Amino acid sequence: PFPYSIDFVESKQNEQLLKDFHGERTGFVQVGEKRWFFPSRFKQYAESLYSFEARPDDTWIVTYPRSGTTWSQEMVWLLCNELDFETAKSIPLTQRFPFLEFHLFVHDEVKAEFLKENEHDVESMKFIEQLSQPAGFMLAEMKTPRFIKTHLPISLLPPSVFEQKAKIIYVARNPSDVAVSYYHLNRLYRTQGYVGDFETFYNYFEKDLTPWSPYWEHIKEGWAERDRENVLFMYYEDMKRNLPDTIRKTAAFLGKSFSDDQIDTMCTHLDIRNFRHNKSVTCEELKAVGILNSGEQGFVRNGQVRGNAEEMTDDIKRRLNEWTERNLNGTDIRFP
Ligand SMILES: Nc1ncnc2c1ncn2[C@@H]1O[C@H](COP(=O)(O)O)[C@@H](OP(=O)(O)O)[C@H]1O
Numbered sequence: 610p611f612p613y614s615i616d617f618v619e620s621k622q623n624e625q626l627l628k629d630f631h632g633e634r635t636g637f638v639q640v641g642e643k644r645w646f647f648p649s650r651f652k653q654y655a656e657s658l659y660s661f662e663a664r665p666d667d668t669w670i671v672t673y674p675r676s677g678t679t680w681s682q683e684m685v686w687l688l689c690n691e692l693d694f695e696t697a698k699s700i701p702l703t704q705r706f707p708f709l710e711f712h713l714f715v716h717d718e719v720k721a722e723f724l725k726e727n728e729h730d731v732e733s734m735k736f737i738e739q740l741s742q743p744a745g746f747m748l749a750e751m752k753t754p755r756f757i758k759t760h761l762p763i764s765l766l767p768p769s770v771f772e773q774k775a776k777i778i779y780v781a782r783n784p785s786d787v788a789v790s791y792y793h794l795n796r797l798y799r800t801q802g803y804v805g806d807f808e809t810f811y812n813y814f815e816k817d818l819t820p821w822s823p824y825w826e827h828i829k830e831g832w833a834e835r836d837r838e839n840v841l842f843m844y845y846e847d848m849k850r851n852l853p854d855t856i857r858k859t860a861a862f863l864g865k866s867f868s869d870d871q872i873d874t875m876c877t878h879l880d881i882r883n884f885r886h887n888k889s890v891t892c893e894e895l896k897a898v899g900i901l902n903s904g905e906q907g908f909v910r911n912g913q914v915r916g917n918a919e920e921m922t923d924d925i926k927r928r929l930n931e932w933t934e935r936n937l938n939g940t941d942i943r944f945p
């Protein structure tokens with residue numbers, strides 16, 4: 610029994626959201642007291658997601674979006690499969706590390722547009738319909754240790770995750786970097802279909818009117834679990850600064866041991882210079898059927914901490930600073 614309320618967004622704000630975000634064509638929902646924001650298909654799959662059966666030897670990466678999930682997934686997958694770079698190259702990351710809730714963002718009306726554009730390639734159409742189905746099925750079939758990506762906040766996780774004491778890597782990135790990256794993602798992915806500019810998109814981000822917001826609640830619930838035996842909390846920013854330390858810390862958490870030389874190999878493999886040319890971690894399967902707008906910046910983009918952003922303005926930076934102070938006041942959360 611899915612225990613939290615699901616309410617369509619107030620109708621006038623829901624209308625504006627439908628005008629700016631063309632990947633959704635029914636409406637947006639807010640979930641529970643915290644008003645967790647999602648497209649209409651959350652109402653439809655809530656029960657499936659909540660009752661999804663975790664296993665004790667699952668490895669879960671939970672993050673707010675564009676907080677360093679893909680980087681972390683590749684690191685973790687290799688650490689838990691004897692650094693098997695060959696298999697990592699030949700199986701896509703989305704197959705090795707399935708995205709639990711991706712299917713929420715594949716609307717019927719929008720899937721009709723993908724199918725029309727691929728309507729001559731039966732395999733391309735079988736792939737597109739599969740994107741519409743919960744990953745949870747293929748995952749339940751698996752008889753090997755599983756790797757699961759989610760942006761579901763702690764409080765919206767399948768309860769079997771903590772019940773089974775499965776391992777969770779929670780990664781947090783700073784709001785400024787997340788806002789700019791998230792905007793690019795919303796323009797890149799036709800499943801989102803965002804048309805407006807960064808100023809408009811930041812205003813939606815600040816009002817928690819983007820998928821998986823409230824951002825600050827997502828981070829607080831993360832931080833609140835970081836003392837648990839089965840949780841590892843890390844800042845993207847520290848992971849960028851000291852890879853050898855990140856890899857070794859992550860390996861220790863998962864109960865794995867590797868030589869200075871294996872860590873060195875992993876540093877080369879996970880450097881952005883090599884990673885952005887890596888077949889298995891760029892979304893080649895998705896770009897092949899036209900789900901990605903090719904024009905935009907790429908799912909593996911820059912990977913910088915507080916790097917140059919043309920989109921960012923003094924007025925947005927000052928609001929981001931204020932929004933940071935109202936939310937982090939009387940907590941010990943500090944981005945490095
Ligand atoms: N090998 C790597 N090193 C550092 N950052 C990486 C990386 N691969 C991907 N990223 C960055 O992680 C962010 C996306 O995170 P996620 O996987 O959670 O969507 C993007 O941020 P930018 O758009 O700031 O470059 C992306 O470029």
Ligand SMILES: COc1cc(C=O)ccc1O
Pocket residue numbers: 674675714760798800801
């Ligand atoms: C491939 O990763 C993602 C895809 C989407 C598409 O709507 C949203 C969030 C993600 O993290």
